[PDB]
Design a protein around this ligand. Sequence first.
Ligand SMILES: [Ca+2]
Ligand SMILES: [Ca+2]
Ligand SMILES: [Ca+2]
Ligand SMILES: [Zn+2]
Ligand SMILES: [Zn+2]
Ligand SMILES: [Zn+2]
Ligand SMILES: [Zn+2]
Ligand SMILES: [Zn+2]
Ligand SMILES: [Zn+2]
Ligand SMILES: [Zn+2]
Ligand SMILES: [Zn+2]
Ligand SMILES: [Zn+2]
Ligand SMILES: [Zn+2]
Ligand SMILES: [Zn+2]
Length: 546
Amino acid sequence: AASFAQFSNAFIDDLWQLSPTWALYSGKHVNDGYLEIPDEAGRVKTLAFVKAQQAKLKQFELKSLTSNETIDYHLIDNLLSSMAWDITRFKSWQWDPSSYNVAGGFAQIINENFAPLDDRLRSVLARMENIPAYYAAARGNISQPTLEHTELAVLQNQGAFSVFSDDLLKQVADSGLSDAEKALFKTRFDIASKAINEHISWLNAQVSQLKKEGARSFRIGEELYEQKFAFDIQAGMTAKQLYQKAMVDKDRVQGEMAKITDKLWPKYFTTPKPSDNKIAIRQLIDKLSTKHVKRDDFVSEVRKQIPELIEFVNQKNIVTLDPKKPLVVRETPEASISAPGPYDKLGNTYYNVTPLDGMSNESAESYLREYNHWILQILNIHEAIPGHYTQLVYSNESPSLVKSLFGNGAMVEGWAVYTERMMLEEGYGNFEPEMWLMYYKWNLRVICNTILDYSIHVKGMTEEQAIALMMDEAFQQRAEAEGKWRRATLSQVQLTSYYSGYREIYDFREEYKQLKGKDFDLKAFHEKFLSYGSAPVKYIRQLMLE
Ligand SMILES: [Ca+2]
Ligand SMILES: [Ca+2]
Ligand SMILES: [Ca+2]
Ligand SMILES: [Zn+2]
Ligand SMILES: [Zn+2]
Ligand SMILES: [Zn+2]
Ligand SMILES: [Zn+2]
Ligand SMILES: [Zn+2]
Ligand SMILES: [Zn+2]
Ligand SMILES: [Zn+2]
Ligand SMILES: [Zn+2]
Ligand SMILES: [Zn+2]
Ligand SMILES: [Zn+2]
Ligand SMILES: [Zn+2]
């Protein structure tokens, strides 16, 4: 009889046999030469896999599992339910033509310049076989598409030619493949190129028809939104509940900002203070944003700050940090943490911080105003200490393949957002009003991301309303607002992840303070919270309370 550990490993093996492209994206090259044709037999086969793996899952008593195993159990169960639901209910395979594009799988094979070239090219040689079939399947599946995803499909499939390029042909011509393999490659490449171009023509004809005749709305509606929110975020509340909390937080945050602005106004202006609080807040913020690190010192300011945050976390006993896992700041190759995937045992972990070269003087200045004297410190909390990097180190204490592959984005992001608030509450920057004001504008991004995503998909918010939210309520620039609208038209639920995890973590903390009273230790709370890795916050709560 298989143990749960044996089952977990067999499950991943079976998942990769069903979808070797998913394996490829996860960093395991089980069959790079096999292009899955996304037709009805594909869906039937996915649903037969869901059914068989679910029945294997149900053989394990939940009382028979350790804490890590129970996390894996739930992550697997939820992944399975959401696969089935994607096929039978959400049906993005019908209305999102952008989900049909071969370029991605090919780029992952080709762009590993360390992997043997002849092996890569032979994988590509085989993977090209079924490109015509792949796009024939696409056209037979697509039905009542949205205008927006069809437009995205055109643009992304046009990008396929930066992979299916003259440069790929040259690599093939000068490789160690046999002359017969080279000629086959050319034959298949011409057939592939023709098929991609004919599909793009078809997509163009569709966009044109959708513009004339009307198209399915991009707004997924309440029923689908709640189901997607449950599968993706795995919050301990509904989306409607989170939205209602986001509306209240927006008001609380703006009220605090108005108070700070009243106190700081005479310190920075001699002109009168506008009676509309929101114009006043916007003007004070624009003025404070001119204090920023000099452009050429951006990367150095970051290196200087990280040890300052380390010192502060140690001094205040916020969480144990290990001095011999020193974080290496590096100037980004072609600000975020990059870390090896579960199948990459070699790779190192860095803090990628992009120097401001390439950009115009004017873009650089706009960037430095966004990442100003205060916001740069908050960014380094979020990204490095005690945010993402710290949480990643803690998750390396008790890892599992399942958590590494299918872990919860809401928890990972929610933690990083939580740390910003917790650090300031614990005295970071010594309760400086400027710092709090800037933090609050930053917090509004996260709150308003939730309002926006929900209101668009559930409440029919218009483009003009979405732009006025982001600019007038969250004090963002035009370009940022427009980018956010576009992202919300093309994706659903992901935008709520930041606030959802933050709210659950902070509320769980306050609940735990209540339960332990005088015996509440902040540091012990943090370390125990981080010990489960990237599990959904509600499961961490349940394990910590049980
Ligand atoms: Ca077939
Ligand atoms: Ca528009
Ligand atoms: Ca406005
Ligand atoms: Zn098997
Ligand atoms: Zn690889
Ligand atoms: Zn049929
Ligand atoms: Zn359960
Ligand atoms: Zn309100
Ligand atoms: Zn400046
Ligand atoms: Zn400094
Ligand atoms: Zn500074
Ligand atoms: Zn300062
Ligand atoms: Zn983050
Ligand atoms: Zn339990």
